[PDB]
């Protein structure tokens, strides 16, 4: 009963952590394509392929990943609202703080026309958020 709440929060927090890693790995890959397409060491064929690849990253994909992240945390918060003990109510409080931050990041992404700039606006925040979510996992398990 109460165990299924703890299990549900653990699953959704783990999925949120994975989603952040997916977003950060996308940023890393995007960055390398932008570097490659202006590189002086690469030939024209290779730079052209890198320019094509840099153009295939979408704001839609970033926004989808952020909606996936928000949804995992929102389920975590709804489930954690059933927590009653001193340590797991603290986990619930951290998750609500993280939910609010995710909404702020989704708003920041909207106000950036340039996709790389949108990633740059959120990378520090999501890296810190992943660490905070790792703390949450320890607080309850």
Author numbering: 208 to 348
Can I see the authors' text?
B. burgdorferi BBK32 is a surface-exposed lipoprotein with multiple roles in vertebrate host interactions. While the interaction of BBK32 with fibronectin and glycosaminoglycans is formed by non-overlapping binding sites in the intrinsically disordered N-terminal region of BBK32 (BBK32-N), the globular C-terminal region of BBK32 (BBK32-C) is now known to bind specifically to the initiating protease of the classical complement pathway, C1r. Previously we have shown that the C-terminal globular domain of B. burgdorferi BBK32 (termed BBK32-C) blocks classical pathway activation by binding with high-affinity to the initiating serine protease C1r, and preventing both its autocatalytic and C1s cleavage activities within the C1 complex. In fact, there are relatively few examples of pathogenic strategies which specifically target the classical pathway and BBK32 is the only known inhibitor which directly blocks the initiator protease C1r.
Preliminary limited proteolysis experiments suggested that flexible residues were present at the N- and C-termini in BBK32-C. A number of constructs were designed to truncate BBK32, ultimately yielding a C-terminal truncation mutant lacking six residues (i.e. BBK32(206–348)) which produced protein crystals. Importantly, the BBK32(206–348) construct retained full C1-binding, C1r-binding and complement inhibitory activities. BBK32(206–348) crystals grew in space group P65 with one molecule per asymmetric unit and diffracted to 1.7 Å resolution. BBK32(206–348) consists of five α-helices and adopts a helical bundle fold. Starting from the N-terminus, helix α1 (residues Ser-211 to Met-245) interacts with helices α3 (Lys- 256 to Ala-286), α4 (Ile-293 to Lys-317), and α5 (Leu-323 to Ile-347) to form an anti-parallel four-helix bundle. Helix α2 (Asn-251 to Ala-261) does not participate in the core bundle motif but rather forms hydrophobic interactions with helix α1 and sits at an angle of ~120° relative to helix 3. The protein surface is characterized by several contiguous positively charged regions with a larger negatively charged surface being formed where the C-terminal and N-terminal helices meet. Overall the structure of BBK32-C is best characterized by a positively charged anti-parallel four helix bundle where a fifth helix, helix α2, protrudes away from the helical core. In the BBK32-C structure E308 is a surface exposed residue located midway through α4, while Q319 and E324 are in the short loop connecting α4 and α5. Q319 and E324 are also surface exposed and together present a contiguous surface region.
